[PDB]
Design a binder for this molecule. Structure first.
Ligand code: HEM
Ligand SMILES: CC1(C)[C@H]2CC(=O)[C@]1(C)C[C@H]2O
Length: 408
């Protein structure tokens, strides 16, 4: 039974749509397919749902892109639905608008910029190869539990200088951040609050140990960047390091599952990558267009009319990033991966000042993964009659991906 709120006076009945971002209609056929059901030919650009506390949903790529690019009109002071969870959320610098955001993003970029990420290629490759060689001769694996949940976590924990044994603890907190438990906005607010506290408890001793530290790990490097000519304050550092863990543990893991389910059903596309290695390298961004996983929100700063829609200060707008990359008004045949597509524009990493700081790392992990996978498992398929299981939320998830091949 679903919790419902009544529409506020400024929301007209013709814009109401019953959409549950934490359990989308049609989700059993796929996360991306379920969001695409919302984006019908005559669907208004902004629709309002009475679920998850009541909130708007942007249904077209142009609005999603514009909202992300417009922090003065759409603030990050709340970026989660329901509102109770968004108010409890404390990660840095995602809760900040410019100019407070700027010095912290500069600090993060010191650790995650493209030049720094390029240095990581070979250690990423050795992690990938080690895992793949564990099952490549077997002729089958469960891709989720044997690879996609293992490879990016091992990469990030090594990069962050953290013990691999912490993977389970951190994954459980991350699950409750992005798909918080509860049948009620207040309940989900409390679940996110508890997970966010778990992250802060975990990172606080690490921060204390690495301030002024001599380590070369990502945390030491970012933590010791000065903010306004001074050491980063404790409150900001806790949210900053927690956000790095959240991005490192619950983004690429889920992206890889969706990507691999598609490739397993499209052997002609896999064969193109095999025959043309540059098409793989140049085609990775088209994968990011096609397999968005994040759906988060912004806070309407002022009463306004936006794309013909009356919004009130404090209204929340959910931005399902899949509805940019998969918008048929932006991309012809949007559900098809076309490695040669010239225009790959998407909001999978969002836009504007908060555009994903980890995107260089994400791109490199995916590129190295495909290169090492195809070198050892060049052909593969989804097990006959297998049914992946899908979850929707602020970050989408998929599990049960049994793959099969003839060992080479
Ligand atoms: C498939 C992979 C990934 C996707 C789809 C993704 C998506 C996103 C999105 C949509 C945002 C903007 C959130 C908002 O402000 O509303 C973001 C921000 C961010 N991401 Fe990623 N991300 C990915 C990988 C990573 C990785 C591996 C890291 C490594 C730590 C990371 C770190 C960050 C950080 C620090 C920010 C905050 C940037 C800021 O506020 O200025 N992300 N990401
Ligand atoms: C929405 C995000 C994916 C993005 C900002 C968050 O809080 C994330 C959950 C991690 C980071 O990459």
């Amino acid at each position: 039974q679903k919790h419902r709120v009544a529409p506020p006076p400024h929301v007209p009945g013709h814009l109401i749509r019953e959409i549950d971002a934490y359990d989308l209609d049609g989700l059993e056929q796929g996360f991306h397919e379920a969001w695409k059901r919302v984006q019908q030919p005559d669907t208004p650009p902004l629709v309002w749902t009475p679920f998850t506390g009541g909130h708007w949903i942007a249904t077209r790529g142009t609005l999603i892109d514009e909202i992300y690019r417009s922090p003065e009109r759409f603030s990050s002071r709340v970026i989660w639905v329901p509102r109770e969870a968004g108010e409890a959320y404390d990660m840095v610098p995602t809760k900040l608008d410019p100019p407070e955001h700027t010095p912290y993003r500069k600090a993060i970029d010191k650790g995650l910029n493209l030049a720094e990420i390029r240095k990581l290629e070979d250690q990423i490759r050795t992690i990938a190869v080690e895992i793949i060689e564990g099952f490549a001769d077997r002729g089958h694996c469960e891709f989720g539990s044997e690879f996609s949940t293992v490879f990016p976590v091992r990469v990030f924990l090594a990069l962050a200088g953290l013990p691999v044994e912490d993977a389970t603890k951190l994954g459980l907190l991350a699950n409750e951040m992005t798909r918080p438990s509860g049948n009620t906005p207040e309940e989900q607010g409390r679940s996110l609050e508890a997970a966010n506290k778990g992250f802060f408890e975990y990172v606080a001793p690490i921060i204390a140990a690495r301030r002024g530290g001599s380590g070369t790990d990502l945390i030491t490097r970012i933590l010791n960047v000065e903010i306004d000519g001074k050491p980063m304050p404790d409150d900001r550092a806790l949210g900053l390091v927690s956000l790095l863990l959240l991005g490192g543990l619950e983004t690429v893991v889920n992206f890889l599952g969706f990507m691999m389910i598609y490739l397993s059903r499209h052997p002609e596309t896999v064969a193109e990558m095999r025959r043309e290695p540059l098409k793989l390298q140049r085609g990775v961004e088209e994968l990011f267009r096609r397999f968005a996983v994040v759906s988060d929100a912004r806070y309407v700063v002022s009463d306004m009319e936006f794309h013909g829609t009356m919004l009130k200060e404090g209204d929340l707008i959910l931005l399902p990033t899949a509805l940019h990359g998969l918008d048929d008004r932006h991309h012809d045949d949007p559900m098809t991966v076309d490695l040669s597509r010239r225009d790959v524009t998407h909001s999978t990493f969002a836009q504007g000042p908060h555009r994903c700081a980890g995107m260089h790392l994400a791109r490199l992990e995916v590129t190295v993964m495909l290169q090492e996978w195809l070198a050892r498992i060049p052909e593969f398929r989804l097990k006959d009659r297998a049914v992946p299981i899908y979850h929707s939320g602020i970050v989408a998830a998929v599990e049960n991906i049994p793959l099969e091949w003839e060992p080479q």
